[PDB]
C-alpha cells in the first residue's frame, strides 16, 4: 500500500466546507443520502474496550457501542459515543467503509453492546440510560448499506469492447477494452498498442460499438472490426451502457442535422487544456448532433488530427461571448492578445459568423456547489490521479475547480454534473489513492 | 322538479365520470381520500328518537356503514349489521350527514342501531370492533376541505366586463347578482337582461380588460372615461391558461395574422365546428375571428374573441383528421368540403400548425360516461349528459333524451361540465331526459 | 388447450381486476405509465410485405393505434385512420410487438398503413401530425421495466425447506427444478414427488429456518448436523418474503403473545373453502406457532398440525365468521346451526385468543365483487384457473372458479401470491384452465 492523503486535518478545523454527497448525481449513495442526518444514532465499532465479548467463529471480531452523528462532510461522519460528557473521544469515520449499523443490528445477531472503558463505571446496567438516549431517536433504515452497495457497481464489466477518443490523436476514436474498474472509473486499453487511460463510465468520450460508423466519426480499430462495421458480439459495449443527455428519437433516422454549420465560431473548453476556454471553429458536422471542432488557439494544422468531437448539447461548448459575459479570461486565438481580442474584430478579420444563441440550450440546476467547497477531482490530463480540490468559481452550471497547493494554471473548467468530481471521502470508499497538496 | 339520478345509479354498469375528472369541481383535490370499502358514521333513518339530543346539536342519530360504490358525488351506503342488501341506500356524499368513525363519541353521542337489526346484540361492542378494526375511514378534516372548495372567488356586487350576448363582438359591463355553485348570474348595466356562466368562463374579464387588450366595450359614460373602485372585479379573480409574462409589455404579437384561416367552435352554436377567419388581431394573444358559415355581414357585429391559446380553436384540417363532420362555410357542402379547394377559392392561407399548441392530458373521460352539463345556449340549465365522443382533449357531449343535433363540443377542462350529483350539492336544478311521447 | 379470454373481453361490461391490484404481478409498479387514449406503434396485420426488412431484425411492419380499453394485461387497440371499430383488436400488452411512437423511425423503419385505409392519403404526414401531436405515448423504458419485473428471485438448483404436503406438521428439504412466472416447482429430496408454489408463498423457507424456529424438519443426517457453513445452493433469508422483521423479536425469539390452548379461527390449509375454529398446539420462536384445525377427526399424533405465523392474514379471532356473515365450519362433533363460540368454550373449557393478539389492516386493495382474474388451485397448484371475486370481506377475498360449484371457492387474502391479473397465463406461458363443459 502507498501513502494516500487523509482529510483528517481539514475535517478537524472549524468551518470546513465540503460539497455534500447529494451534489454529485453519479456518486455512490446519492439517492439514499437523505436517509442520513445529524443527530441520528448508530451502532459502531467500540475502539475503547477489552476483548470480553465471546465472538462466534466466522463472525466479526468487532465489539460495538452506540454513537450520535454530529457532522457529515461528504462521506465523512463525526461520531460521539453515547455516555461521554465531553468531546475528547469524538472521532471521524468513513460512513460507507466502517462497521456502522442501524441500532438493533447487534441484538438480532446475539451480540451485546459493550460500553467504552472510559465510561464503563457510570452504570451497572446501561438499560435505563440507553432507553433514555435512544427512545424516539432516528437511526438507519435496515437496507441502507445494501442500497449503498448496489450504487457502487459499474454498468460495465471487464472485457467489454468500446470506442473511445484516442488520447494520441483526439480526432479519432479507437477500439479499446476494459481491463480494470475502480469506483466506476474504467481503465481502457487500446488495441494495436499497449497503451491506455482511465475514465469514468459516464464520460462523454467513450461510445458503444458501432458509434463512429453510425455518426461518421474517424475510427481506428483492428481489421476484423473495421470489416464488421462496413457491413450495415457478446463483448460489445452497447448503447444502454452509455450516458447521454439526449435520445436518438430527437433526430431524424439518418441523423442529418441543420443547426451548427461548418465555419461557425463559438467558445469551448480546450480538451487538451481544461484551464482554457477558447474561441473554436466547427470543422465538420457529423450525424445525430455530433460535430468536429478546432480550438482556435492551436498552432496551424491542415491535417486536422487535432480536431475534437463535441455533441451539440455538450455543456462544454458556449456561444461566442460567454467568457466576456461571465467575467472569464478568454484564451485568445492564435496570433491575438487578451487585451487586443474582441469577438467583433476577430469575426471581421476571419470573415466568419458566430453560432447563434438559439443553437445552445443550457439549463442551470440548483446543483448546490459553492465557492470554497472541498471535493475530490480527477486530473483530466493524467486521469490516473484523483486529487484534493476546491471549487474556485461557480458560473451558472459551470465550475472552475482548483487543485489545492498548485498554481491556477492547473485549474479545470468542469460542468456541475461532471463525472470527474467526487465527494470528500470518495477515494477511501472506492479504494483509490488521493493526491494531497504538493510540498 | 329536479331530476334524480337514482334510476341510472340502480342499474348495473352505470359509468359516471369520477369527481377527479373535473379540476374545477368541489372536492376534486381531496377526493382520493375516499375509497370503496371504507367505513363512515352516517344518519340512521331507521330508529326511534331514543337518543337524548343536546340543544344546538344535530337531532340526528348515527350508525356505521360501508361505502360500496362511488359514482360522482353519489355513494352507495350499507349499514353494518344487516344480513341482506335490501336496506342499502344511495347518499349525496357532500350533503348528507356523514362523518369519520369516532366523530360521535368525541361529542358524547352514542351510535344507535337501525330498528330492523337492533336485537341482534345486546352489547354491539364485539361486533363493531370485529368490523371496524384496521378499516379505513375519513380524515377528520375531509369535509372542512370540501366546504372550502365550495366558495366562489367572486362575491355579490362585483362589476366585470363580459361578452354581450346581443352583440358578441363587444364586452359589456355587468354585475354579479347571484351565485350558484360558482356559476355567476351577470346582470348587464343598462338592462334587466343578463346571463349565467361559471366563474372560470373565458367570456368574463376584469375591469379594464377591454381597454388594455383593444376589445370593443359597451359601458356607462363615466366608466369609459375612467378606463381611458371597491366593486371592481380585478385580474386575480379570473382564470387564464397563460400569463402576461409570456407577452411583450405592450402586448404586440406576431403569431396569428389578419386573413388567416382556421377552425373553431361556433360561439353561437356549440354543436358546430366551422372554418373561421382572423378579422382583427388584438393585444396579448386575443383576436377577433369570424365563423365562415355565417350569412354575409360587413358590420363585424358577429366577430368573436378567442385567445390564441383557447382549446376551442384548431388548425385547418382538425375536423377532417378526426372524422368530425365540419360545418361548411356559407355556400359550401359539408361532406365534400376540402381546405385545399376552399383556400384556392378564397386565395387565403391557413394558420400554420406551429401557431397552435394542443397537449392531450390523461383526462379520464371515456365514451358512455354520465355527467352533468350546462346548456351553453341556455346557461340557466344544467342537464343530464353523456360523453358521446372523445377527440384528443375535446369532448362531444350528448344530452340524454335529445337528438345528436343538440350535442355540444366541450374541452375536457371546460368549466361547464360537472360530476354526477353536482346539482344536488350546489342546490342547482338538474334537467332530466325528456320523456319519449310515443 | 389453454383458455382464451377473448370471448369474455368481447362482451360489454367485462370487469377485470386491474394489474395494480396485484402487488406481486409483473408490471404493477410501472402500470400507471399506461392509460386509455394513449398512442402506440403496433404490428400492422393488414398489409403486404412491402417494407424492406433488414436481416436480424423483426420482419414485422408497424402502424399507430390508440388504446381504447385495458383489462388486466389485455388492451383493446384501434388503428389510427379507421372510421369504425370493425378492425379493433385485443392484444397481450406485454407479449405483442408494442412500442412507443418513434421507435420505428429510430430504427429506420417506415410506418405502413393498413390496406383497408391506405387509399385515404398519399402522404400520411398531415394526418399523423394532427392525430399524434401533444398525445401520450409510452416511456421508452417501459418494456425494459416489465422485463425486469418478470424475473424470479430464485434460480434452478436452489435448496430450501418447505411444508411437506404429505405431512404438513413438518418442513422438508427440496430443490427448485422449474420456474414458471415466479411459480416454483419444488422437488423433495428423497422423492420424485413435489409441488408448485409462488416465490412469495409463506410455506417455503430458507436453509436453517426450521432449526432456528423450532419447526419439525425432515432432512438427511448431514443437513441436520450442519444446522446444529453456507453451501452455494442454499436459498438464503433475503430470497424470502416476510411481513415482519426479526428485529421485532428478542434475540432468542421467545414470544409472549399466543399461548398453548388458546382458540381462534383459521383458514383450513387442507381445505381453502373452510374457515374453522382452531387451537394453538405449540408456540415456536419468532412468532411462529403450530395450530390444529378443530374440524379434523381426532388425531393425537399431531401430524396434521399446521404452522401459521402470528402475523398471518389467514388467522382470525374467534367470532370472525359470525361477525362477517361467513358460514363457519363447526368443530368435530358440532352442527352449523347449533354451534356457538360460547357453547364451545364452555364444553372444552378453553379461552379465545384476544383481539389485541391479531393485527389486521385493511388496505384499499381495489378488488370488487364480480371482478375477473386468474387464480391458482391451492389443492392442485399445477393449475391456474379462470376465477371471479365472489365476496370481499375486509381484506379477505372469496374467490370463485367460474363454472364450478361453490364448494371449490377459496378464501384468499387480497395480497395472496396465488392470484393474478387477466392475461397473466399468456404473459407467463402458463396454461389457463377455463370453465368446465
Amino acid at each position: 500500500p502507498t501513502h494516500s492523503y487523509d482529510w483528517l486535518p481539514r475535517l478537524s478545523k472549524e468551518n470546513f466546507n465540503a460539497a455534500p454527497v447529494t451534489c454529485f448525481p453519479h456518486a455512490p449513495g446519492c439517492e439514499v443520502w437523505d436517509n442520513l442526518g445529524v443527530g441520528m444514532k448508530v451502532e459502531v465499532e467500540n475502539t475503547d474496550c477489552d476483548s470480553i465479548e465471546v465472538i462466534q467463529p466466522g463472525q466479526t471480531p468487532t465489539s460495538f457501542w452506540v454513537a450520535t452523528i454530529l457532522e457529515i462532510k461528504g462521506y465523512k461522519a463525526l461520531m460521539s459515543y453515547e455516555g461521554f460528557d465531553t468531546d475528547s473521544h469524538d472521532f471521524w469515520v468513513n460512513l460507507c467503509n466502517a462497521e456502522v449499523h442501524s441500532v438493533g443490528w447487534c441484538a438480532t445477531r446475539g451480540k451485546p453492546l459493550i460500553p467504552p472503558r472510559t465510561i464503563e463505571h457510570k452504570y451497572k446496567d446501561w438499560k435505563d440510560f440507553l432507553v433514555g438516549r435512544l427512545s424516539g431517536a432516528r437511526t438507519l433504515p435496515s437496507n441502507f448499506y445494501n442500497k449503498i452497495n448496489d450504487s457502487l457497481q459499474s454498468r460495465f464489466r471487464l472485457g467489454l469492447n468500446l470506442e473511445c477518443v484516442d488520447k494520441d490523436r483526439i480526432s479519432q476514436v479507437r477500439l479499446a477494452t476494459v481491463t480494470k474498474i475502480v469506483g466506476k472509473r474504467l481503465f481502457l486499453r487500446y488495441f494495436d498498442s499497449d497503451d491506455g487511460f482511465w475514465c469514468h463510465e459516464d464520460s462523454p468520450i467513450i461510445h458503444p460499438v458501432g458509434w463512429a460508423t453510425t455518426v461518421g466519426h474517424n475510427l481506428a480499430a483492428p481489421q476484423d472490426y473495421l470489416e464488421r462495421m462496413l457491413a450495415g458480439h457478446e463483448d460489445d459495449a452497447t448503447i444502454e451502457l452509455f450516458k447521454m443527455n439526449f435520445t436518438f428519437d430527437e433526430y431524424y433516422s439518418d441523423g442529418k442535422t441543420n443547426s451548427f454549420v461548418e465555419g461557425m465560431k463559438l467558445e469551448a473548453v480546450d480538451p487538451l487544456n481544461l484551464s482554457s476556454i477558447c474561441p473554436a471553429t466547427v470543422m465538420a458536422v457529423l450525424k445525430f448532433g455530433y460535430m468536429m471542432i478546432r480550438i482556435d488557439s492551436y498552432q496551424p494544422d491542415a491535417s486536422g488530427s487535432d480536431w475534437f468531437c463535441y455533441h451539440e448539447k455538450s455543456p462544454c461548448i458556449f456561444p461566442a461571448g460567454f467568457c466576456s459575459v461571465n467575467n472569464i479570461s478568454v484564451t485568445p486565438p492564435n496570433g491575438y492578445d487578451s487585451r487586443t481580442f474582441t469577438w467583433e474584430g476577430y469575426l471581421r478579420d476571419t470573415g466568419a459568423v458566430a453560432a447563434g444563441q438559439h443553437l445552445f440550450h443550457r439549463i442551470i440546476p440548483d446543483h448546490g456547489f459553492e465557492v470554497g467547497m472541498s471535493l475530490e477531482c480527477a486530473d483530466l490530463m493524467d486521469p490516473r490521479l484523483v486529487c484534493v480540490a476546491t471549487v474556485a468559481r461557480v458560473v451558472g452550471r459551470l465550475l472552475k475547480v482548483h487543485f489545492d497547493g498548485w498554481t491556477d494554471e492547473y485549474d479545470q473548467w468542469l460542468d456541475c454534473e461532471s463525472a470527474d468530481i467526487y465527494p470528500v471521502g470518495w477515494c477511501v470508499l472506492v479504494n483509490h489513492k488521493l493526491e494531497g497538496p504538493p510540498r | 322538479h329536479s331530476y334524480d339520478w337514482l334510476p341510472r345509479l340502480s342499474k348495473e354498469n352505470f359509468n359516471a365520470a369520477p369527481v377527479t375528472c373535473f379540476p374545477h369541481a368541489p372536492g376534486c383535490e381531496v377526493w382520493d381520500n375516499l375509497g370503496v370499502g371504507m367505513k363512515v358514521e352516517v344518519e340512521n333513518t331507521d330508529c326511534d328518537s331514543i337518543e337524548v339530543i343536546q340543544p344546538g346539536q344535530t337531532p340526528t342519530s348515527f350508525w356505521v356503514a360501508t361505502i360500496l360504490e362511488i359514482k360522482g358525488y353519489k355513494a352507495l351506503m350499507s349499514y353494518e349489521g344487516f344480513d341482506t342488501d335490501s336496506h342499502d341506500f344511495w347518499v349525496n356524499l357532500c350533503n348528507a350527514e356523514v362523518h369519520s368513525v369516532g366523530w360521535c363519541a368525541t361529542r358524547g353521542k352514542p351510535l344507535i342501531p337501525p330498528r330492523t337489526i337492533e336485537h341482534k346484540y345486546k352489547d354491539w361492542k364485539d361486533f363493531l370492533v370485529g368490523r371496524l378494526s384496521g378499516a379505513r375511514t375519513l380524515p377528520s378534516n375531509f369535509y372542512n376541505k370540501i366546504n372550502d372548495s365550495l366558495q366562489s372567488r367572486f362575491r355579490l356586487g362585483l362589476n366585470l366586463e363580459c361578452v354581450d350576448k346581443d352583440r358578441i363582438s363587444q364586452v359589456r359591463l355587468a354585475t354579479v347578482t347571484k351565485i350558484v355553485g360558482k356559476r355567476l348570474f351577470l346582470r348587464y348595466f343598462d338592462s334587466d337582461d343578463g346571463f349565467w356562466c361559471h366563474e372560470d368562463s373565458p367570456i368574463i374579464h376584469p375591469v379594464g380588460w377591454a381597454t388594455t387588450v383593444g376589445h370593443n366595450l359597451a359601458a356607462p359614460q363615466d366608466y369609459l372615461e375612467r378606463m381611458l373602485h371597491e366593486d371592481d372585479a380585478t385580474i386575480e379573480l379570473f382564470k387564464m391558461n397563460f400569463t402576461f409574462d409570456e407577452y411583450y409589455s405592450d402586448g404586440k404579437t406576431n403569431s396569428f395574422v389578419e386573413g388567416m384561416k382556421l377552425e373553431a367552435v361556433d360561439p353561437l352554436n356549440l354543436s358546430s365546428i366551422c372554418p373561421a377567419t382572423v378579422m382583427a388581431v388584438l393585444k396579448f394573444g386575443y383576436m377577433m375571428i369570424r365563423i365562415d358559415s355565417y350569412q354575409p355581414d360587413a358590420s363585424g357585429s358577429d366577430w368573436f374573441c378567442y385567445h390564441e391559446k383557447s382549446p376551442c380553436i384548431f388548425p385547418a384540417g382538425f375536423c377532417s383528421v378526426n372524422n368530425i363532420s365540419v360545418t361548411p362555410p356559407n355556400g359550401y357542402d359539408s361532406r365534400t368540403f376540402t381546405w385545399e379547394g376552399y383556400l384556392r377559392d378564397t386565395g387565403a392561407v391557413a394558420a400554420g400548425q406551429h401557431l397552435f399548441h394542443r397537449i392531450i392530458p390523461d383526462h379520464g373521460f371515456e365514451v358512455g360516461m354520465s355527467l352533468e352539463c350546462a346548456d351553453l345556449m341556455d346557461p340557466r340549465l344544467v342537464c343530464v349528459a353523456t360523453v358521446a365522443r372523445v377527440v384528443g382533449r375535446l369532448l362531444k357531449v350528448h344530452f340524454d333524451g335529445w337528438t345528436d343535433e343538440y350535442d355540444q363540443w366541450l374541452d375536457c377542462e371546460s368549466a361547464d361540465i360537472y360530476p354526477v350529483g353536482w346539482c344536488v350539492l350546489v342546490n342547482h336544478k338538474l334537467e332530466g331526459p325528456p320523456r319519449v311521447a310515443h | 388447450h389453454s383458455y382464451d379470454w377473448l370471448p369474455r373481453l368481447s362482451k360489454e361490461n367485462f370487469n377485470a381486476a386491474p394489474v395494480t391490484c396485484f402487488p406481486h404481478a409483473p408490471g404493477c409498479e410501472v402500470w400507471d405509465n399506461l392509460g386509455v387514449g394513449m398512442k402506440v406503434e403496433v404490428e400492422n396485420t393488414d398489409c403486404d410485405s412491402i417494407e424492406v426488412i433488414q436481416p436480424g431484425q423483426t420482419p414485422t411492419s408497424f402502424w399507430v393505434a390508440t388504446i381504447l380499453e385495458i383489462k388486466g394485461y389485455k388492451a383493446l387497440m384501434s388503428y389510427e385512420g379507421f372510421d369504425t371499430d370493425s378492425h379493433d383488436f385485443w392484444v397481450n400488452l406485454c407479449n405483442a410487438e408494442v412500442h412507443s411512437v418513434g421507435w420505428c423511425a429510430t430504427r429506420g423503419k417506415p410506418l405502413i398503413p393498413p390496406r383497408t385505409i391506405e387509399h385515404k392519403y398519399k402522404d400520411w404526414k398531415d394526418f399523423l401530425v394532427g392525430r399524434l401531436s401533444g398525445a401520450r405515448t409510452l416511456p421508452s423504458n417501459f418494456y425494459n421495466k416489465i422485463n425486469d419485473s418478470l424475473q424470479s428471485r430464485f434460480r434452478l438448483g436452489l435448496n430450501l425447506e418447505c411444508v411437506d404436503k404429505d405431512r404438513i406438521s413438518q418442513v422438508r428439504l427440496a430443490t427448485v427444478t422449474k420456474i414458471v412466472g415466479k411459480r416454483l416447482f419444488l422437488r423433495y429430496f428423497d422423492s420424485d414427488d413435489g409441488f408448485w408454489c409462488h416465490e412469495d408463498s409463506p410455506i417455503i423457507h430458507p436453509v436453517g429456518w426450521a432449526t432456528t424456529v423450532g419447526h419439525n424438519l425432515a432432512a438427511p443426517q448431514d443437513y441436520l448436523e450442519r444446522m446444529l457453513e453456507v453451501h452455494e445452493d442454499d436459498a438464503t433469508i433475503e430470497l424470502f418474503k416476510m411481513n415482519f422483521t426479526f428485529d421485532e423479536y428478542y434475540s432468542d425469539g421467545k414470544t409472549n403473545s399466543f399461548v398453548e390452548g388458546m382458540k381462534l379461527e383459521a383458514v383450513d390449509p387442507l381445505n381453502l373453502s373452510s374457515i374453522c375454529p382452531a387451537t394453538v398446539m405449540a408456540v415456536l420462536k419468532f412468532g411462529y406457532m403450530m395450530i390444529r384445525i378443530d374440524s379434523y377427526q381426532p388425531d393425537a399424533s399431531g401430524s396434521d398440525w399446521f404452522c401459521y405465523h402470528e402475523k398471518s392474514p389467514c388467522i382470525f379471532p374467534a367470532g370472525f365468521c359470525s361477525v362477517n356473515n361467513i358460514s363457519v365450519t363447526p368443530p368435530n362433533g358440532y352442527d352449523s346451526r347449533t354451534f356457538t363460540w360460547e357453547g364451545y368454550l364452555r364444553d372444552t373449557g378453553a379461552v379465545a385468543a384476544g383481539q389485541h393478539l391479531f393485527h389486521r389492516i385493511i388496505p384499499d386493495h381495489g378488488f370488487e365483487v364480480g371482478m375477473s382474474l386468474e387464480c391458482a388451485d391451492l389443492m392442485d397448484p399445477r393449475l391456474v384457473c379462470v376465477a371471479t371475486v365472489a365476496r370481499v370481506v375486509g381484506r379477505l377475498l372469496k374467490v370463485h372458479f367460474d363454472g364450478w360449484t361453490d364448494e371449490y371457492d377459496q378464501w384468499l387474502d387480497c395480497e395472496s401470491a396465488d392470484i393474478y391479473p387477466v392475461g397473466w397465463c399468456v404473459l407467463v406461458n402458463h396454461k389457463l384452465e377455463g370453465p368446465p363443459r
Binding site: 437523505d34 436517509n35 444514532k41 470480553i52 442501524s102 441500532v103 438493533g104 447487534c106 441484538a107 438480532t108 446475539g110 451480540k111 451485546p112 453492546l113 459493550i114 451497572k124 446496567d125 446501561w126 438499560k127 440507553l130 432507553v131 435512544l134 427512545s135 424516539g136 431517536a137 432516528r138 437511526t139 438507519l140 433504515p141 435496515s142 | 382520493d32 381520500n33 375509497g35 379505513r136 | 428485529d247 421485532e248 423479536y249 428478542y250 434475540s251 389492516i361 388496505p363 384499499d364 386493495h365 381495489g366
Partner: peptide, 30 residues
C-alpha cells in the same frame, strides 16, 4: 392505492448488554 410505503416509519429494535436485553422504539426514513 392510498396505502403504500411512507417517507418514515417507527421501528422496534432490541439491545443486548451483559446485564440483559430490552427493546427501544426508534425511527428511520424509508
Amino acid at each position: 392505492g392510498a396505502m403504500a410505503s411512507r417517507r418514515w416509519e417507527q421501528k422496534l429494535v432490541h439491545i443486548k448488554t451483559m446485564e440483559g436485553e430490552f427493546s427501544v422504539t426508534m425511527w428511520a426514513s424509508g
